[PDB]
Amino acid sequence: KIHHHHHHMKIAVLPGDGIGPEVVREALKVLEVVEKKTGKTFEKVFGHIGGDAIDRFGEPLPEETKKICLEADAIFLGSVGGPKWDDLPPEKRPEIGGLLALRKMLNLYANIRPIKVYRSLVHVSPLKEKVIGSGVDLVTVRELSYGVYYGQPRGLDEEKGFDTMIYDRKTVERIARTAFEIAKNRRKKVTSVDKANVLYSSMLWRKVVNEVAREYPDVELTHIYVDNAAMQLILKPSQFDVILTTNMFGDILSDESAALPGSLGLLPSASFGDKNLYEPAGGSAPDIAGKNIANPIAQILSLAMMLEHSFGMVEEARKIERAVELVIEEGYRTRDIAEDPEKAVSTSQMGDLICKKLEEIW
Template structure:
């Protein structure tokens, strides 16, 4: 089982070091890791944010553990050389089409949420967002109409195979959780959504153990405020997923703790090939000072163990150790605590 470790820029290296510490402590037989440069550091060392050797390593690996990219010193580079392009390049090269964003409230952190503690405490959901289609990738332009008016347009669309593959990812994720899947669309108005709904219902026949429901996106935005605890797994398109996953993150409040996965179609011997990264950025302002909170990175490792390596029990062990550390008051500066990066990593290892 090969994991490509791409620490990247800013706080990337320090949080990656703690994730590796946790991985080593799990002492799983047959795991190999290999490092490669990505982002601004890759540009400086190799002239490109995603050098060929990094890409080859990722292609050969079963999973990619990704820190963060982004470096103010690179802001004046041409767009294709900027650090952020590395993640887009990886998504494309590895054909990653499914973005998984868990939003979970950890005990003791209810104060981080703008929601009432009794509402926030219930949050334990996973948003599965389609990443390659929808109105973000359709034909688009600003054009001049025959009558001289300017018009902006973007074509929203989904084809049935695009919906089918993300639906399978979502149903499988639901099987590994609470076995409830809510598909979010706007089928009362949009034909794209009507096809989405039709195909999700077709796919549901293969997952009789998962309870499927449907919700309009405006209602979903309401329900995420009123009672986010009602959701287990949510599956939706690229645009609605962009909005709802950010809303759900904010419902939790502690953005610094949130992990994510991007999965593709490639099956490894152990699961689905994917890329795993914290949703926070490279935080150049605190880089190299040991102040970063590595928990989102460690939770990204847990997702990697679950989805790419089929090691559910080990994943749950890591997540429980993080929850225990938080419950014991081990908090980084982002949570109002004083633990530094290595101390947090050690605290998680001690609770494995």
């Protein structure tokens, strides 16, 4: 879609449980800098989800929260879940009854997971410095609406279980275009990952991606098998810009690529849907909840994704990205990325450093 200049935006903020609130607080301090500099109004409507909603309403995704989510332009979500609520069944716990239920209600079709290895944290990566090479800067664009997680028929009886892996043209068109557009505004390269040598779903996938790629003549398209992509993420990850793939392969590969920066606290996530959903790629951290330890960068970079993809504020998002990088490049580390742990800054300190830097470079 075309993003026109808008000066009033509405965000549903659902801070969650445990570290959620701590890191969402910092993200919102960065949003305050953006607000000051751009003169735009971000109307924030706060909503209760997960443990917070169970306590207040008796259920993890109450009607009130759903209404807030459906009335906002974008949804900004912290983390949900904690030991207080474990021991509730399945359907009633935060992570299932709250988070998975929200995701389902949004009819999401794409998950976008950017992965950067910062030059200054290469020593934190599991990969040797020469393997990282000229650098890692990629994005997985994963199909979320169909494929094997939703294909019918599916079922389980006493002797067998089955699922159907299926793609159709309209589904693949939608996600392919998403990936091509992201590629257009990045390094103009898409790699599509499938298993077209063995699976019919993947033969259809590849056929339709090749069709869409004609609408984007300036974007380089390569195709690789998922097993070979799994090896290439480790042997030469710098070859990738946008990685376009299926529900299942994207699930496996985006988690593999998450090992590369070597901390989940660094990694943002966006899902595109009826409304877009912005959240850290990693989950609950019950053992540090409340201690001002958690790394806020994932939540902050999720804010940057929201600005870019919900609001078309691409320049602003790139400035947030730059301020994070500059603070890291300066040597500042939360515990999750510190070699010397007693030299770690807190959640709140890290958040203030990023805000002061963003004001500096703006």
